[PDB]
Amino acid sequence: GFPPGPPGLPFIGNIYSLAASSELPHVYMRKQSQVYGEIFSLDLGGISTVVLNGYDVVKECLVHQSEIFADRPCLPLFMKMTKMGGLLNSRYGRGWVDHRRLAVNSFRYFGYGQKSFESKILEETKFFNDAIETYKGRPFDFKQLITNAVSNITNLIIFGERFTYEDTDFQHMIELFSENVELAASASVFLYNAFPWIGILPFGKHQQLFRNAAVVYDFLSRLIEKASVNRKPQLPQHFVDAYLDEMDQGKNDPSSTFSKENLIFSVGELIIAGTETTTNVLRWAILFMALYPNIQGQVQKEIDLIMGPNGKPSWDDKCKMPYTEAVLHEVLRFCNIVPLGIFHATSEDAVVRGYSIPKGTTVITNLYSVHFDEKYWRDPEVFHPERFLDSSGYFAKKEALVPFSLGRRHCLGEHLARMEMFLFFTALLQRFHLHFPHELVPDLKPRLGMTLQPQPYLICAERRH
Ligand SMILES: OC[C@H]1O[C@@H]2O[C@H]3[C@H](O)[C@@H](O)[C@@H](O[C@H]4[C@H](O)[C@@H](O)[C@@H](O[C@H]5[C@H](O)[C@@H](O)[C@@H](O[C@H]6[C@H](O)[C@@H](O)[C@@H](O[C@H]7[C@H](O)[C@@H](O)[C@@H](O[C@H]8[C@H](O)[C@@H](O)[C@@H](O[C@H]1[C@H](O)[C@H]2O)O[C@@H]8CO)O[C@@H]7CO)O[C@@H]6CO)O[C@@H]5CO)O[C@@H]4CO)O[C@@H]3CO
Numbered sequence: 001g002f003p004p005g006p007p008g009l010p011f012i013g014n015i016y017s018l019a020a021s022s023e024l025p026h027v028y029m030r031k032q033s034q035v036y037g038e039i040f041s042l043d044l045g046g047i048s049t050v051v052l053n054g055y056d057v058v059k060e061c062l063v064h065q066s067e068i069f070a071d072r073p074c075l076p077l078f079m080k081m082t083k084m085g086g087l088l089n090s091r092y093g094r095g096w097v098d099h100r101r102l103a104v105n106s107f108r109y110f111g112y113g114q115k116s117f118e119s120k121i122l123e124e125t126k127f128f129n130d131a132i133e134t135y136k137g138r139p140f141d142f143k144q145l146i147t148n149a150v151s152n153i154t155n156l157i158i159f160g161e162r163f164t165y166e167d168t169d170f171q172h173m174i175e176l177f178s179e180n181v182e183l184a185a186s187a188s189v190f191l192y193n194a195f196p197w198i199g200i201l202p203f204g205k206h207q208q209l210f211r212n213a214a215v216v217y218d219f220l221s222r223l224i225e226k227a228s229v230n231r232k233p234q235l236p237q238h239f240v241d242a243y244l245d246e247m248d249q250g251k252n253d254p255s256s257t258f259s260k261e262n263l264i265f266s267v268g269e270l271i272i273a274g275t276e277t278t279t280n281v282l283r284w285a286i287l288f289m290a291l292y293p294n295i296q297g298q299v300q301k302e303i304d305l306i307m308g309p310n311g312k313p314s315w316d317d318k319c320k321m322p323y324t325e326a327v328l329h330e331v332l333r334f335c336n337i338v339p340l341g342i343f344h345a346t347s348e349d350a351v352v353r354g355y356s357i358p359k360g361t362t363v364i365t366n367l368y369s370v371h372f373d374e375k376y377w378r379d380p381e382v383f384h385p386e387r388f389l390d391s392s393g394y395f396a397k398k399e400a401l402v403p404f405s406l407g408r409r410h411c412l413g414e415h416l417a418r419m420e421m422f423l424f425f426t427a428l429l430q431r432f433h434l435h436f437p438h439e440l441v442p443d444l445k446p447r448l449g450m451t452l453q454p455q456p457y458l459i460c461a462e463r464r465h
């Protein structure tokens with residue numbers, strides 16, 4: 001019948017287990033799969049949940065049974081925030097198809113599908129690097145500038161413009177939205193979802209999340225208004241105009257799923273999905289380059305060979321730069337920015353590997369455990385870019401690397417993110433040498449959150465040529 005799993009206390013189930021563990025949840029779950037198998041279950045305060053561990057079981061569900069596992073779970077928090085509409089936490093259905101299709105098309109059309117786009121990224125690297133230079137090699141935290149820079153790339157697509165690094169109102173909105181992605185992972189919210197009557201309690205991380213969500217919702221709708229002011233119907237300049245075009249064409253269809261609400265939800269989802277994740281990839285990579293300068297320098301050696309010490313980075317250089325691509329893939333594999341993906345749910349009663357999974361069960365894809373699957377990786381616990389190089393020195397793509405997930409819900413911003421990653425990384429490492437202050441001992445244990453990010457750390461960036 002249902003998959004087995006560790007026991008915990010009545011009422012709260014394995015919320016106790018996760019909470020009581022020294023380990024972060026994805027690590028905890030991986031360890032439990034060594035006892036209970038690749039597919040096991042957790043009881044999260046009475047919400048029944050199955051966890052998928054290792055590459056084979058994750059592929060078997062999200063790919064072989066893609067429609068069955070394409071859904072999102074109706075956790076109280078998700079219902080409150082977005083009523084299971086929008087895009088990211090939309091239920092699998094027509095609503096999702098509509099918003100997904102529009103986003104995919106918008107990102108090609110207003111983004112990388114256009115000849116001029118790559119240089120808009122490069123402009124952002126100049127703004128970014130220039131900002132870094134202003135510190136004149138003195139130690140500082142990159143978090144804010146990186147966030148500014150990365151978020152601007154999607155701002156171009158969604159709003160048709162970048163915002164300046166003085167726009168603290170926008171920055172403040174992103175700051176609250178990040179807290180929410182972090183708080184989504186807390187015991188407090190796992191309990192809230194189990195016992196939603198906890199909403200009566202005025203104190204705690206759940207009230208912080210709802211308060212934040214309110215402030216974020218208002219701001220985003222105000223931006224969306226400002227973005228639609230000069231709109232020329234059926235000639236859109238960005239995703240917002242495109243969305244409004246859609247609402248116009250579905251005016252007489254009552255079952256049309258586009259709405260002012262769903263526009264705010266899907267815009268917010270697109271903004272935070274891009275900013276949280278890519279920012280953190282770069283923050284992890286910078287951390288590791290400062291920690292392992294022989295790797296940093298080998299990357300820089302390739303930049304100098306292929307880009308020259310002075311030439312403008314190009315996406316087209318990627319395939320002349322396998323060691324650089326290797327480092328970046330190894331950051332993704334090792335640091336696991338989205339360790340447990342986004343939770344799925346079964347759109348119907350499912351049977352997988354003999355076990356039954358009733359419709360609506362939360363299904364956690366432990367992407368961490370895929371990246372550490374010893375069937376497919378040698379010494380996964382070791383940071384070693386070289387694992388991605390083949391015997392001729394070229395980058396070798398591995399099927400068991402899935403940091404953007406698989407199946408119907410796979411990251412929709414994958415291609416854009418890879419361009420940003422590559423171009424920001426090379427632009428930065430071409431212009432600066434990075435190292436820690438007083439060579440201070442930095443912390444590599446990630447913070448608990450729906451994404452993994454490093455603790456605050458200072459860096460010195462010193463010009464090179
Ligand atoms: O005031 C009497 C109060 O009695 C009952 O509440 C008890 C509660 O059930 C217990 O859990 C415990 O509370 C402790 C709590 O568990 C700790 O977490 C803590 O608080 C920290 C929080 O963790 C942290 O989040 C933050 O708190 C901030 C809030 O998150 C934030 O939302 C805001 O709070 C303000 C609210 O916006 C607003 O509701 C208003 O509060 C009034 C309530 O509306 C009203 O119901 C009543 O509260 C009763 C309650 O009904 C019982 O269940 O009066 C409140 C006015 O005093 O104003 C809030 C205050 O600004 O801002 C806070 C900023 O702190 O930080 C704290 C740091 O400690 O400590 C608690 C220790 O008591 O006990 C309480 C009763 O003591």
Ligand code: HEM
Nearest residue numbers: 088273274277278338341342404405409410411412413417
């Ligand atoms: C390093 C960069 C990124 C990483 C590691 C990452 C990671 C992920 C992961 C793990 C998922 C889970 C999919 C699932 O199993 O349901 C996902 C989906 C998603 N991502 Fe990303 N992401 C990145 C960049 C982006 C960017 C740049 C955007 C938007 C600009 C974005 C927007 C989304 C959205 C909207 C979904 C949900 C898609 C759906 O529900 O169909 N992500 N991403």
Ligand SMILES: C=C1/C(=C\C=C2/CCC[C@]3(C)[C@@H]([C@H](C)/C=C/[C@H](C)C(C)C)CC[C@@H]23)C[C@@H](O)C[C@@H]1O
Nearest residue numbers: 081180181184213216217264265268269273276450
């Ligand atoms: C969609 C929106 C809202 C909330 C969005 C949230 C709040 C809870 C946590 C969510 C659902 C995140 C979940 C946990 C997914 C996070 C993945 C890992 C991302 C960061 C890659 C994404 C949007 C977050 C309501 C409101 O604030 C407007 C905003 O547009």
